[PDB]
């Protein structure tokens, strides 16, 4: 069983497919991070001419000062509509599908060949402080959740995609991954996206290295199948809730 990302846009249909086991369980699909508690300029690229745009030139490509510092351009970019450095904002995701794996739950796979360093998806969710994180830690332990969706954003910001998020919440762990997180600044605000680290052939599952900080007493066995698999999500050591949440 597999599904395409447009299938998640219809809640009534999704929920009906979920009862037939053809789609993952329902969650609230959101377009950007939602803060439970709200918290407290231009590159120097020379504008492409109309002809350069027609010739296939890239606006705000590898040499863009914002891109080099992992900062996205705004609407006021000198390249205007042609700016290729607004991928998070324009939702310029990779072509991926959500698939059911043998024993990791649902997962993500490339629907086309993905070049190296290709933006996959933004890891969206609810952003929590340490206080809200501890409450969610307790709720999810109480509910006996199997999957966890906490992603450290910065010291007192944890992205939680358990209840709200997008299809990035399905990316599974591998000890030999083909994606990575990148922290990108969008409107002075930090975001986390997934990017391929290599050429990912069509049909391959997309994975990244969780660097999981396990606070739970029980370690989840790792089914990544890598020759160098660490055996468990989080490795050997259990850390405290405070340490896992960014101290």
């Amino acid at each position: 069983p597999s599904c395409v990302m447009d299938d998640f846009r219809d809640p009534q249909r999704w929920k009906e497919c979920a009862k037939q086991g053809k789609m993952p369980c329902y969650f609230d699909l959101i377009e950007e991070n939602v803060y439970l508690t709200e918290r407290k300029m231009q590159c120097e690229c020379t504008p492409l001419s109309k002809d350069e745009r027609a010739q296939g030139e890239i606006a705000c490509g590898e040499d863009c000062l914002n891109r080099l510092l992992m900062i996205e351009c705004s609407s006021r970019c000198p390249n205007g509509d042609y700016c290729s450095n607004r991928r998070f904002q324009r939702k310029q995701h990779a072509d991926v599908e959500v698939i059911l794996t043998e024993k990791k739950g649902w997962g993500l796979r490339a629907a086309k060949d993905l070049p190296s360093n290709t933006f996959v998806l933004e890891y969206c969710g609810e952003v929590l402080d340490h206080k809200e994180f501890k409450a969610r830690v307790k709720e999810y332990a109480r509910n006996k959740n199997i999957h966890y969706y906490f992603m450290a954003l910065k010291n007192d910001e944890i992205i939680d995609a358990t209840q709200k998020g997008n299809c990035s919440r399905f990316m599974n762990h591998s000890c030999e991954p083909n994606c990575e997180t990148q922290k990108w600044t969008v409107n002075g605000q930090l975001r986390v996206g997934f990017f391929t680290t290599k050429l990912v052939p069509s049909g391959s599952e997309l994975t990244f290295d969780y660097q999981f900080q396990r606070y739970g007493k029980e370690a989840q066995k790792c089914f990544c199948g890598s020759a160098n698999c660490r055996g468990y999500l989080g490795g050997e050591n259990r850390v405290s809730i405070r340490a896992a949440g960014g101290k």
Partner: peptide, 14 residues
């Protein structure tokens, strides 16, 4: 003292 939880930690792939 929960059962199986934890937090994923962004890092650049090395």
């Amino acid at each position: 003292a929960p059962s199986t939880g934890g937090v994923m930690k962004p890092h650049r792939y090395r």
